[PDB]
Design an enzyme around this catalytic site. Structure first.
Site, short mmCIF file in Angstrom:
data_model
loop_
_atom_site.label_atom_id
_atom_site.label_comp_id
_atom_site.label_asym_id
_atom_site.label_seq_id
_atom_site.Cartn_x
_atom_site.Cartn_y
_atom_site.Cartn_z
CD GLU A 15 7.88 -16.85 -4.31
OE1 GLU A 15 8.02 -16.90 -3.07
OE2 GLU A 15 8.86 -16.81 -5.12
CG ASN A 57 13.29 -13.03 3.43
OD1 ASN A 57 13.02 -14.12 3.01
ND2 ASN A 57 12.67 -11.96 3.01
CG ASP A 74 17.37 -9.51 4.41
OD1 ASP A 74 16.27 -9.95 4.79
OD2 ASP A 74 17.47 -8.81 3.40
CB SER A 85 13.64 -8.17 4.30
OG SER A 85 14.11 -9.33 3.72
CG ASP A 122 9.85 -12.73 1.19
OD1 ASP A 122 10.41 -11.70 0.87
OD2 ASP A 122 10.42 -13.79 1.18
CG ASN A 166 12.28 -8.86 0.66
OD1 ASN A 166 12.97 -7.86 0.91
ND2 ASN A 166 12.44 -9.98 1.25
CG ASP A 220 14.06 -3.56 -10.52
OD1 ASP A 220 14.08 -2.34 -10.69
OD2 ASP A 220 14.80 -4.14 -9.70
#
Ligand code: NA
Length: 129
Positions: A35, A46, A48, A50, A52, A59, A101
């Site tokens: 990562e 990203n 979209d 967003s 990280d 995110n 989650d």
């Protein structure tokens, strides 16, 4: 801060990640390697909009607030910048929420594609833990 492999393993162990929801430590180390290359200051944008953040590339669409991700949530209740600290506590505490989650570590696309189903114990071999 750029961690060494064993240094990070020790930190993660101390923060309760070894076997957290059944993921052995090497899994966490493996995911961090791919990562962020163990750099707590890593950021990546990203498609979209967003971003990280940090050693585990958490995110902003769901987990933290960066003030620039419209319509997002802040489920860890933290500024995304806290995730960049040399102190990994906020990243770990948030990762424990993420891995709980529903999808386990599959939440981390690099874990699924590069660590899952590999010998992850290799990531902590040789470390004093
Ligand atoms: Na957010």
């Amino acid at each position: 801060k750029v961690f060494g492999r064993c240094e990070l393993a020790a930190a993660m162990k101390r923060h309760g990640l070894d076997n957290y929801r059944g993921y052995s430590l090497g899994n966490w180390v493996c995911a961090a390697k791919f990562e962020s290359n163990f750099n707590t200051q890593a950021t990546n944008r990203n498609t979209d909009g967003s971003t990280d953040y940090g050693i585990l590339q958490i995110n902003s669409r769901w987990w933290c607030n960066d003030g620039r991700t419209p319509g997002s949530r802040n489920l860890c209740n933290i500024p995304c910048s806290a995730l960049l600290s040399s102190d990994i506590t906020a990243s770990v505490n948030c990762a424990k929420k993420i891995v709980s989650d529903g999808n386990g570590m599959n939440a981390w696309v690099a874990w699924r594609n590069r660590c899952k189903g590999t010998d992850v114990q290799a990531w902590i071999r040789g470390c004093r833990l």
